[PDB]
């Protein structure tokens, strides 16, 4: 039989080594069952607790426990988690006191709308990331994240700004979203649209969001996980999207008598990582 | 008397313990060697077996071991294995049961080709990545690894297509890479092509890999490690490469009868690590 | 009475058991204390080892000490120290041996000066970047970082060499710092600027930093952290700087006879990893 549940003692008129304990083993009287009996438990007692700590079982005859089951601990029980949805609640294990390598990033901003003139639009800026290490969380429910949204485009005609991308928040810190794209009209450069920026507690490392261009290069900044996305001359309104998560459209383009809509940013995500032995 | 090998009983008449005396101590009538030679020899075998999973002498007089060779555990024995060769096998070593932050990348191509013109030609696009956490891996021989090609460059003349990009594969994911830049004549744009794609059993996080151009910016699209590069204004057929893993072309600029066959992008490479007591 | 000072022996005249004594369990013979004794002391000191190496007190009933303290030395006790100063040393814990994934990045280039004309000056390069994963030190004192120092910005004049950055490196290992941009008059645009590469004892990964342009696109350099930032086409000189650490200045510009003197180049960083039961 595997599962053997042992903590010896287990109540049993226990009793913890005196301080005469401590200076030597035993005594020179009998040998009582009720000092030897805590020495077996406590012993015992943790063993098994470091065993099913980790969602293992104690075998009397493995003798090894997957290295006293450390290597699920610390190599197994690496169980990441992504998020996507708009808003939501994280969920928090029983036993899970800390979240290691917290990532989030803003979402992207769209870039701006181009007519069929000369001049060329601007495309938007990317939004910012974070890591955080070591955050110290408790048992129970998370603070619902909010992620932020993709850079939405306003497709009702050229020369309207592409909306800005939002802004995400966990654990206390705040990843601003990158602005949107400024869309001009004929003979007009628009204005090089900055990106996110990180607000709330300090992170341990910030990426400030790529920010947008004039329109000349009609880049649209980058992240973390994004880079810079360059603008594409077609009469169809191919828009090719940010590449990752948090960048921006490259924006509309100019050529040929034709309007391009803007780039389409990616929105943003949520990284968390922890070891435990339930369902991540 | 540093080296103690200490499993006590080693076929000493060992025995289970009645469920009595795991509800309640030791029984107060004659002592059982018998059942003392297991319970001692359980634990002994538990605390030198942690001191062995890290590959640490068992000691009597040091009672610390670096604690209980945990902080060789966790801190020490971080194994980092860089796979480069596009053919071979990983060798996993026998105290490995799983494979965490497989960090994988894939080639990018070069860029396309432009002749003694006006307009120049599409930059390299740039190779996919994923990173998968605490893959499953059994002890052994893993199934052989495929890393990308780098970006081969058709350097035959101008006005021809750039090579291809090679895809890397691991543990059933695969990242694709970048395909290379088109070759045009003179008196025309290249139309842009799209860089890596992630394929096959779906990443806990993907990079898709940055895309080309379509010839004007010319700047060769990033992947993971790299950033985007931009062209070079030179006759003289300098065309300075990607900067890192993944890169793509640049691609070969066009002005004053220059024959820039373009930047040639190096190979993905696959990052694993594991934690073990044998060599990396 | 929650710690004990808990190794139970303390001088309680310790014997190690005989090989013979080893290979079987308790002989038929007398119980004897100087067996009784060590070996309940080692199994006991073992685990007091395990706790208070932890950065966790020693407990009588608790019978878990969070599971053995070992989530205080897997992800609890995770400390990161992220060095910004200057120059000065990096001071290693009396516990810590090993630093998790040190991580680095050059200092970045700033761009050079463009007068009144046609042409536009070229961007600086950006810092080189590398990951050490597993590194071994020894307790102690570490070898003085150098990190780079921020490129600032030459604002000697129109068209004159833009200031360069310092180099970073730290426990053997140097990554190349990006390099200032050139300085050209009117009517006239130099070639691109290299960035910096990863010298010294060569990682496991190296990050080569972004090279500028010739100065027709004019875009920042880049690195692991910093991305590439583009120029501004404005009449006041805005001069916007690299997003994030590593970053090099998008150089000077000029369009209807403004005078920019170019962004500055952004100073390199030191990430570390370690784990030690002291705060950082």
Redesign the interface.
Same mark, same amino acid.
Request: charged share 15%; aromatic share 10%; proline share 4%.
């Given at each position: @039989?595997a599962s053997? &549940? =042992?903590?010896?003692?287990?109540s049993?008129?226990?009793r913890?080594?005196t301080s005469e304990?401590?200076?030597?083993?035993?005594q020179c009287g009998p040998?009582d069952?009720?000092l030897?009996?805590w020495?077996?438990?406590?012993?015992?007692?943790?063993?098994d607790?470091?065993i099913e700590?980790?969602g293992l079982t104690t075998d009397?005859t493995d003798?090894?426990?997957?290295?006293?089951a450390?290597?699920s @601990?610390?190599?197994? &029980? =690496?169980?990441?988690v992504?998020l996507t949805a708009a808003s939501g609640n994280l969920p928090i294990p029983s036993?899970v006191?800390?979240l290691?390598w917290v990532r989030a990033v803003g979402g992207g901003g769209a870039g701006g709308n181009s007519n069929t003139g000369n001049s060329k639009a601007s495309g938007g800026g990317?939004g910012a990331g974070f890591d955080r290490?070591?955050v110290a969380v408790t048992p129970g429910s998370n603070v619902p994240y909010t992620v932020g949204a993709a850079g939405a485009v306003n497709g009702l005609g050229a020369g309207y700004n592409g909306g800005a991308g939002g802004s995400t928040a966990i654990l206390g810190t705040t990843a601003g979203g990158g602005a949107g794209g400024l869309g001009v009209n004929n003979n007009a450069?628009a204005v090089?649209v900055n990106?996110g920026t990180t607000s709330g507690t300090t992170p341990?490392?910030?990426?400030?969001?790529?920010?947008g261009?004039?329109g000349?290069?009609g880049?649209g900044?980058?992240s973390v996980?994004s880079?810079?996305?360059?603008?594409?001359?077609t009469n169809a309104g191919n828009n090719?999207p940010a590449?990752?998560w948090g960048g921006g459209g490259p924006g509309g383009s100019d050529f040929g008598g034709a309007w391009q809509p803007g780039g389409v940013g990616k929105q943003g995500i949520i990284?968390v990582?922890?070891?435990s032995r339930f369902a991540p």
């Open positions: @039989m053997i &549940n =042992l903590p010896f003692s287990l049993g008129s226990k913890i080594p304990e401590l200076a030597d083993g035993y040998l069952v009720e030897d009996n020495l077996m438990w406590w012993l015992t007692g943790q063993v607790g470091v700590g980790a009397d003798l090894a426990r997957l290295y006293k450390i290597q @601990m610390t190599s197994g &029980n =690496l169980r990441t992504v036993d006191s800390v290691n990317g290490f070591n450069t090089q990106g341990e490392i910030s990426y400030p969001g790529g920010l261009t004039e000349i290069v880049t900044g980058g996980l880079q810079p996305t360059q603008r594409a001359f090719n590449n990752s990284i990582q922890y070891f």
